[PDB]
Subunit: 114 residues, 2 copies
Amino acid sequence: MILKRAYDVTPQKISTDKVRGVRKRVLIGLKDAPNFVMRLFTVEPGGLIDRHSHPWEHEIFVLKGKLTVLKEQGEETVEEGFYIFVEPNEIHGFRNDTDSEVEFLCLIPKEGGE
Amino acid sequence: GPSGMILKRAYDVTPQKISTDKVRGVRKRVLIGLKDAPNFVMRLFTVEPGGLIDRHSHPWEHEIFVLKGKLTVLKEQGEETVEEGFYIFVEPNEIHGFRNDTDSEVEFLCLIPKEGGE
């Protein structure tokens, strides 16, 4: 059994043409997980994960702040205490329009990698 | 399966009493359940003050994230208390359980492969 403070997992900066101002912690990764992986994303103020889609679903829980969720059209802001289920193939992305960091858990089946 | 995205306040789900020979003082919200999940389910457990999930094991793993309070984790050997912001991975067949020794509700997300139900 593994019991660990998530903050102590070293975050990975992601900074690409589609993703800026994001950090990703892999809490339960391919090394441990039989079926699905557990990540924790931090989105800095102004951070953006562009619209994209995957052949797998996402299961998300918003841990901190106000997360702007981009949909195939339009967007919806939700806050800490919301869960999100993104169906397979659904176009989606995320933005932080607030002045403080936003955090969410994001789990995918292991075919999506870690 | 279907398209779209569900976005919902977890507390808009009513916490339902779990009562079995090995569990007392616990409620559960199914957030992403069997009716929708392709692979794995997401539940939010509430452990009332003095609530107990006795040591047990399952043939599937558990992935847990502690949301609120101080959760005492029962292991095959001894116990350990963690708090909000901890995650827990429980291997398949690993003996584990939980207790709330505090005065206030403890909450944690618990995800399992959907073959284990919801």
